[PDB]
Design a protein around this ligand. Structure first.
Ligand SMILES: CC(=O)N[C@H]1[C@H](O[C@H]2[C@@H](O)[C@@H](CO)O[C@@H](O[C@H]3[C@H](O)[C@@H](O)[C@@H](O)O[C@@H]3CO)[C@@H]2O)O[C@H](CO)[C@@H](O[C@@H]2O[C@H](CO)[C@H](O)[C@H](O[C@]3(C(=O)O)C[C@H](O)[C@@H](NC(C)=O)[C@H]([C@H](O)[C@H](O)CO)O3)[C@H]2O)[C@@H]1O
Ligand SMILES: CC(=O)N[C@H]1[C@H](O[C@@H]2[C@@H](O)[C@H](O)O[C@H](CO)[C@@H]2O)O[C@H](CO)[C@@H](O[C@@H]2O[C@H](CO)[C@H](O)[C@H](O[C@]3(C(=O)O)C[C@H](O)[C@@H](NC(C)=O)[C@H]([C@H](O)[C@H](O)CO)O3)[C@H]2O)[C@@H]1O
Lengths: 99, 99, 99, 99, 99
């Protein structure tokens, strides 16, 4: 499920809660115009996970990637807090939700 | 169970021992006002895992996150040493306790 | 499968999409003339995964390696975006594609 | 079992060889007075794994932690080279020894 | 199996190809005179994996460690490119070779 804190923190922003998503792809891309981490759901929706060059976004972005990678590789659900102001939508928070 | 060392180290602080917690969620959040790592128990309690910018808190905080992530992903218990001076409570030490 | 985003981002470059590859080897080599990460398919084709010294190529190249390592160790498929301008061909994007 | 090299290197120091230990706990602690990584065996012995701020102790200490973490999480044995000059004893070398 | 590229790159150096080795130990040692990462085969042979302080040897040596660690923990074979000019012999390249 989704933690109350996760839902409440997402509700304090312009981003949308996406609940119990099954990710089936994660990619890393070093191409000039498309650099970044993308994740895709079984339905084919794609999100972008922004990177962080400085503390604390550096280690926090790294944990977002580890959560997404584990979700794809172990086939376990996540909750996303995602901004629809971009295409693909940007992940601003992610929660591992295996049960 | 809880190592005697873990219990004794927690007793030397203002933080409370939480024994045999089953974590079911871990999240990473880069939103401006809620930046951080959160973990949630099957009962729905949430804790915050502080970051560390400098040695040795940088590598120690990283190991706390690896313990929490493994606990969620593998569904294994932890012991927490948690400060109630914050909401959510802050984790100041964590022990992986699979058996 | 291949995410539409992965296919479309690869089509915007001179690199070719390689779909549902089964990687059976990954190597790391510190020899003077051959330094780098190589990955090999069950058919015996080899690709090179370039490194990155600076942000953001440093963390992105690290994620490309984690995807390739998981693909080999867990025997799960990937999609590659690979440049044929080099021998072995260079991976410019990789997508973990378990199902 | 224990590699001959591991045994011989430990014998060249003041530290004691501990063979085929089953680790059942690992913790990370950022409390002011008890900062560090601790591991505990099924028999109830506890060790401290020192950190390293500079090359090469930084990456070597990180590998010691990965070995201990995997030993706990996977329930597989290690060999330790531990100094009794401190309580808890300090780990100066660790060997993953699954079989 | 051994990738043709892995074999050919090793043949361009003074190092020897060691094929389908089963590693049963990996150790990290911070002792003054024996600092380093060692791996040992089921036959009892030991190799040393050199570290790297600077780009690109830093990330490449880290990937060699991850390959060796996975080989030990998951009991899967590797290929080594190893120099006999040292005792223990130095690993200059390693290939994960599960099947
Ligand atoms: C109205 C309006 O547009 N309000 C905006 C606000 O506009 C101000 C600016 O345009 C400045 C330029 O200086 O002018 C101000 O007016 C000034 C005038 O220029 C001065 O010269 C002088 O006369 O004084 C006046 C008054 O000060 C305008 O007031 O600008 C702010 C800052 O961008 C906007 O704040 C955002 O508001 C939205 C909802 O309205 C959200 O609260 C957003 O926060 C979040 C989000 O939820 O989207 C939080 C979220 O955690 C965060 N995500 C991450 C990953 O950190 C995102 C993210 O940072 C952004 O969405 C990315 O763009 O933002 C507020 O930041 C305000 O809406
Ligand atoms: C006749 C002779 O000694 N030739 C060696 C050469 O001598 C130089 C003189 O000709 C010059 O006038 O005076 C200089 C002194 O100021 C020199 O003495 O020196 C070169 C560079 O040292 C030697 O090159 C080495 O040659 C080896 C085989 O002949 C071998 O090719 C070495 O390359 C490798 C290797 O295969 O062993 C390439 C490996 O990828 C590399 N491994 C790593 C991890 O990078 C190793 C490694 O760097 C060395 O083994 C470490 O000692 O080197 C090559 O560099 C030349 O033989």
């Amino acid at each position: 499920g989704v933690s109350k804190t996760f839902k409440d923190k997402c509700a304090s922003t312009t981003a949308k809660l996406v609940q119990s998503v099954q990710l089936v792809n994660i990619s890393s891309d070093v191409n000039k115009d498309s650099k970044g981490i993308y994740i895709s759901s079984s339905a084919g929706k794609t999100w972008f996970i922004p990177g962080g060059q400085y503390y604390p976004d550096n280690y926090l972005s790294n944990e977002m990637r580890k959560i997404a990678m584990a979700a794809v590789l172990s086939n376990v659900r996540v909750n996303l807090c995602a901004s629809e102001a971009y295409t693909p939508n940007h992940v601003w928070a992610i929660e591992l939700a295996p049960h």
